[PDB]
Design an enzyme around this catalytic site. Structure first.
Site, PDB file in Angstrom:
ATOM      1  N   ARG A   1      28.919  51.340  68.380  1.00 28.12           N
ATOM      2  CA  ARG A   1      29.776  50.537  67.472  1.00 28.12           C
ATOM      3  C   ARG A   1      31.255  50.723  67.818  1.00 28.12           C
ATOM      4  O   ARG A   1      32.049  49.768  67.626  1.00 28.12           O
ATOM      5  CB  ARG A   1      29.486  50.722  65.991  1.00 28.12           C
ATOM      6  CG  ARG A   1      28.441  49.778  65.368  1.00 28.12           C
ATOM      7  CD  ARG A   1      27.731  50.368  64.188  1.00 28.12           C
ATOM      8  NE  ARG A   1      26.360  49.859  63.989  1.00 28.12           N
ATOM      9  CZ  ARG A   1      25.775  49.853  62.760  1.00 28.12           C
ATOM     10  NH1 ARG A   1      26.476  50.287  61.683  1.00 28.12           N
ATOM     11  NH2 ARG A   1      24.493  49.438  62.618  1.00 28.12           N
TER      12      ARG A   1
ATOM     13  N   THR B   1      24.188  62.333  70.770  1.00 24.47           N
ATOM     14  CA  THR B   1      24.399  60.923  70.388  1.00 24.47           C
ATOM     15  C   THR B   1      24.116  60.070  71.633  1.00 24.47           C
ATOM     16  O   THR B   1      24.340  60.578  72.757  1.00 24.47           O
ATOM     17  CB  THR B   1      25.836  60.675  69.790  1.00 24.47           C
ATOM     18  OG1 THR B   1      26.012  59.247  69.501  1.00 24.47           O
ATOM     19  CG2 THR B   1      26.978  61.146  70.703  1.00 24.47           C
TER      20      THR B   1
ATOM     21  N   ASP C   1      30.357  58.822  72.502  1.00 26.65           N
ATOM     22  CA  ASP C   1      31.631  58.852  71.786  1.00 26.65           C
ATOM     23  C   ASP C   1      31.721  60.073  70.880  1.00 26.65           C
ATOM     24  O   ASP C   1      31.440  60.140  69.691  1.00 26.65           O
ATOM     25  CB  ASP C   1      32.046  57.542  71.148  1.00 26.65           C
ATOM     26  CG  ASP C   1      31.446  57.238  69.806  1.00 26.65           C
ATOM     27  OD1 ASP C   1      31.944  56.422  69.004  1.00 26.65           O
ATOM     28  OD2 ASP C   1      30.394  57.889  69.591  1.00 26.65           O
TER      29      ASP C   1
ATOM     30  N   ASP D   1      25.568  57.237  72.187  1.00 24.83           N
ATOM     31  CA  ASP D   1      26.891  56.686  72.298  1.00 24.83           C
ATOM     32  C   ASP D   1      27.897  57.246  73.279  1.00 24.83           C
ATOM     33  O   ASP D   1      28.744  56.410  73.652  1.00 24.83           O
ATOM     34  CB  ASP D   1      27.632  56.881  70.913  1.00 24.83           C
ATOM     35  CG  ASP D   1      27.145  55.720  70.076  1.00 24.83           C
ATOM     36  OD1 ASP D   1      26.852  54.692  70.726  1.00 24.83           O
ATOM     37  OD2 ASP D   1      27.009  55.865  68.847  1.00 24.83           O
TER      38      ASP D   1
ATOM     39  N   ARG E   1      21.225  61.565  56.142  1.00 21.91           N
ATOM     40  CA  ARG E   1      22.617  61.277  55.764  1.00 21.91           C
ATOM     41  C   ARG E   1      22.881  62.088  54.479  1.00 21.91           C
ATOM     42  O   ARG E   1      22.144  61.895  53.488  1.00 21.91           O
ATOM     43  CB  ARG E   1      22.888  59.808  55.491  1.00 21.91           C
ATOM     44  CG  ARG E   1      22.944  58.881  56.691  1.00 21.91           C
TER      45      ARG E   1
ATOM     46  N   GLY F   1      22.621  60.341  63.823  1.00 26.36           N
ATOM     47  CA  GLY F   1      21.498  59.584  64.411  1.00 26.36           C
ATOM     48  C   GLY F   1      20.783  60.411  65.475  1.00 26.36           C
ATOM     49  O   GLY F   1      21.491  60.967  66.337  1.00 26.36           O
TER      50      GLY F   1
ATOM     51  N   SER G   1      28.895  65.141  62.002  1.00 30.36           N
ATOM     52  CA  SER G   1      28.207  66.431  61.996  1.00 30.36           C
ATOM     53  C   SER G   1      29.198  67.534  62.352  1.00 30.36           C
ATOM     54  O   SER G   1      29.046  68.631  61.785  1.00 30.36           O
ATOM     55  CB  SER G   1      26.932  66.373  62.833  1.00 30.36           C
ATOM     56  OG  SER G   1      27.070  67.148  64.020  1.00 30.36           O
TER      57      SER G   1
ATOM     58  N   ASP H   1      29.742  63.166  65.292  1.00 29.09           N
ATOM     59  CA  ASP H   1      31.054  63.783  64.943  1.00 29.09           C
ATOM     60  C   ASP H   1      31.123  64.000  63.430  1.00 29.09           C
ATOM     61  O   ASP H   1      31.893  64.845  62.936  1.00 29.09           O
ATOM     62  CB  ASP H   1      32.210  63.012  65.558  1.00 29.09           C
ATOM     63  CG  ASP H   1      32.167  61.521  65.265  1.00 29.09           C
ATOM     64  OD1 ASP H   1      32.464  60.715  66.171  1.00 29.09           O
ATOM     65  OD2 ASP H   1      31.835  61.184  64.107  1.00 29.09           O
TER      66      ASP H   1
END
Lengths: 319, 319, 319, 319
Positions: free
Chosen positions: C171, C125, C129, C127, C72, C11, C105, C103
């Site tokens: 998420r 990201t 994370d 995120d 993707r 993303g 990636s 990740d």
């Protein structure tokens, strides 16, 4: 018309790209072809032209400045300049011209029509000082930029109980300072279109100090004078801890506001409509919230004024 | 401890209110009572204190400046000042003090402990020039304020192909100018902690002009000198159309960024933890991304430095 | 190395372009040549590569998204995919690869090294994370985007005395919700890494209502569940006028913040340094405020955690 | 008049505080005294009134929401409600009332005049759907909030080449979606005042895909329907990777824009002028860029429309 041109001249302003985008998209929808002129008038002379495809104007609606660049072209005051320009025009078979810019830019569009090159002017300036329109492209944006600054200044002025003099742009018009000051809740606004008496200004500040407000914001349009002189004066006469801030060129850049984007789209579309329908030597604008068009000559002979009632209200709203 | 005090001193910074809010909420959760000191040190002398209830700090996390105000108190350098202050303290039975502010503010917290008043300092400055912490409260906010300006300037500099000299804050530290310059994609950064040679600066600009970039942005920390002198120099030596912008006090205000809000919450909470647990004469900070605390004396004896590698990188990223 | 490649996958996140810009500028300063891979992995297969000149990366430092696009590519899990990719690579003589992304990636960068293609991963990201770094590129930006929303919501929640449930992104990680909630002065934060009891949540809201606060803000990480379910629950159990807002993809776009710009510049530069110096199969990051690099394999085997103490503090700061 | 009252009712909107501020400052300059009514109509019944001093309205010009709060008061449809209200009024000797709010709020002002309580309505709504004015207080602000979101969405939509459906506010008026869409450079705008054919919408998207634009933005006014249904439809019929975002209540909060601040100042001042001069049962507005006032009865009997030409232009500007 089969082929038009579009240029930006004078000081750039936020919303010029949205303008460029509507000219290009409007024209093509109409099947006409658009050619961009780079570096304004100067580029026009140097034959710095390149066609613009529908996608050359994708992803620019939200950007400040102008993807066409701009420059000062003194050499265009000249019949020689104008000739060299008209030559360049014809050499690409560009039949009409959309000029986006100041009033220095409108003159050029006038001179071009007198030589039979149909031109339509689009008001692009942060200043709002262009006859023929209530609002110019980029003014709303500049306003939001200034109140952004004022909001910040207010925080520090409050914290430290200080008085701030903020110098904003507009060498000949007080629109920025007036709308800003109002929206900002400034205790004093100094514009060029209104007489001011430094004694009164002082009186009001002292009086406000008394009523319990220890901080104060003063807006001064560059047109009136320097932020430093007023600061010096205000401090010497009140004894208040005074600071001066000059906003500068930040007023010129940024991603245009929604209003500046809608305005520039509407006006740029309209200018194209005029060219096609043969009207040339016109300038577009918005008056009384309606899209209008005038003869450049008669609009240029007209004068720029501010709503004095707005200026008055400014004084009644100060504590 | 049954009762603590909190004050803000030195130049206000965005995030001071979030700091105030954590001190007040932390303390009360712990059942301790908080008293606000208004106008910093000066107010402390004049016994300008008022208890703070949990709700006195609701709806302030997002506001710039300090709801406690701040002032310059020279009279506190004095044993007399310090006495009058310690008196005022005791008169309300305030046992401990959280001081949020510059280093001028830390000294005061030092002097207070030497008189047995447990004090903890919280770094609040836009400058980042406070030993004991990687980051001070308000720096991230000031940074975002500057890049906001740079972004705008970039639009107009691009449009008109000009060179701009932007003067930012930090009289003794180049953090603002360094981070700004980097984030802004500035061609040149002048900070105080690094030697510069005006010849080289020039060389790089001309070279960039050549490589095809007609606009340029130069950042200068006020600490190095005036935006006007560099502009004058740069223009005389390159012939480029040069303009100068001084950001000023806008750098001090605004709604604090998320980082400044999280930082100020964490640090203000921590300072309270120290007071309760009896540690006094400490200063809080963040080092290597961890919450730390130092002796004010040994942190004040320490020096402020910038990551020279960051400064280097600045040069490698310029076209 | 004479020639490297750079790609963005997973993303998009604000700051990816500043990353791209440092990779390109770093490499060239070093005399190496950079090739961009478009559409991430998918583009890599389809041999969608084009060299990048120093100016291809001018005026992008401040833009969100990625000028290299992203997609993707399930087909890359495959040895066939990986072969087709390695082929494409060699066909342009691209020796090394800088991968900027999630990740999903990083795995791809791992698989590529096992086939002897030196790859370095850069964490991009919103995120946070990604193991190996305290902060990922784009997180600070997303945070400021969320608190922007919270600030707005607060105004209307205050006006109407209502309770709002705000669903944010992440998420599997609660960083966004945790930092946001803290900075936002949220009464409740629901993250995945911490156990929560709906009874307690309720208890605290009612209690706050009592203490005189009629509005309330609740943050929920999408990872925990739906904003609508919590809203429904909260309303049924308190009787408070409750509204739910899902921020969505606005969290992904925008002009990166100063921190995200400095971070992405530093990390992208570093990744290039590793490639040249022969280190491959590494991932870059920032830990304890220092630039680090790890083996992708050992970082991928590591886990993402949040500072539980920060989560605790969140609870002590709620009225 | 010696004493007036001011209230906010209906959904809050950015600029209500600037409105409150001009009513309070205007009135006092005139020597009249102002009383605030809290919680709108509901508070008016419960006699929730408190005088407002000149400083109670300092530092609010830039804040969103309303410092007077607002509530839904069904009980006011009633003669009983209205009586209880008129009683409360008289009990404080409040002679006139400035009502800031929606149209549900105008009705109440009508009913109050029929009982001889001079009332003037001020249009405060993000919607723009109030007869008697081109623009309502808070619309410009909401617009800038939406384009802020669109700008962000554009970055991620571009990166990933996706189509986004963005649901904005306005249950009965398409102003937000129309101005937004235009300013945002949206490929499609669905408003309630214009017929649309889903086939055509589709046709245009596919066609745009062809012309080389892989991302697309669609704006839908909540009034037309759900962002999720259109997304579902659009995706099923094009095969494009489609995502849906619902902006929600973020549209309601925030620091009002300059225009919203100037508008609310001007209109609130004017409403006071009407009360003093005995005009009651009037509503203020801005038409054709001029300050006007109408009979509430005849303005309420009038209908809300959008500039269909603006809607048309929207279609010509899409690639």
């Amino acid at each position: 018309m089969k082929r038009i041109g579009v240029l930006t001249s004078g000081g750039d302003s936020p919303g010029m790209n949205a303008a460029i985008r509507s000219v290009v998209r409007k024209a093509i929808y109409h099947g006409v072809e658009v050619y961009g002129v780079y570096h304004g008038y100067a580029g026009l002379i140097a034959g710095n032209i390149k066609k613009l495809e529908v996608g050359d104007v994708g992803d620019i609606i939200h950007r400040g400045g102008t993807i066409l660049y701009t420059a000062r072209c003194p050499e265009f005051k000249t019949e020689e300049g104008q000739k060299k320009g008209i030559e360049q025009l014809k050499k690409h078979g560009i039949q009409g011209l959309v000029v986006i810019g100041g009033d220095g830019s409108y003159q050029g569009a006038k001179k071009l029509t007198e030589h039979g090159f149909p031109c339509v002017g689009v008001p692009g300036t942060i200043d709002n000082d262009i006859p023929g329109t209530d609002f110019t492209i980029g003014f709303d944006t500049a306003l939001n930029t200034v109140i952004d600054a004022i909001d910040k200044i207010r925080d520090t002025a409050t914290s430290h109980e200080r008085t701030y003099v903020i110098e904003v742009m507009g060498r000949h018009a007080g629109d920025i300072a007036l709308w800003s000051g109002l929206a900002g809740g400034a205790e004093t606004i100094l514009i060029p279109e209104a007489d001011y008496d430094m004694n009164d200004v002082i009186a009001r500040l002292k009086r406000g100090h008394e009523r319990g407000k220890k901080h104060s914001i003063i807006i001064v349009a560059e047109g009136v004078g320097s932020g430093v002189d007023f600061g010096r004066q205000i401090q010497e006469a009140t004894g208040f801890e005074t600071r001066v801030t000059v906003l500068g060129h930040v007023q010129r850049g940024g991603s245009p506001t929604a209003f500046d984007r809608v305005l520039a789209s509407r006006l740029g579309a309209r200018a194209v409509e005029l060219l096609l329908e043969g009207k040339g030597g016109r300038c577009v604008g918005i008056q009384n919230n309606q899209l209008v068009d005038h003869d450049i000559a008669e609009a240029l002979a007209n004068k720029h004024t501010i709503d004095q009632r707005m200026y008055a209200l400014s004084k009644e709203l100060s504590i």
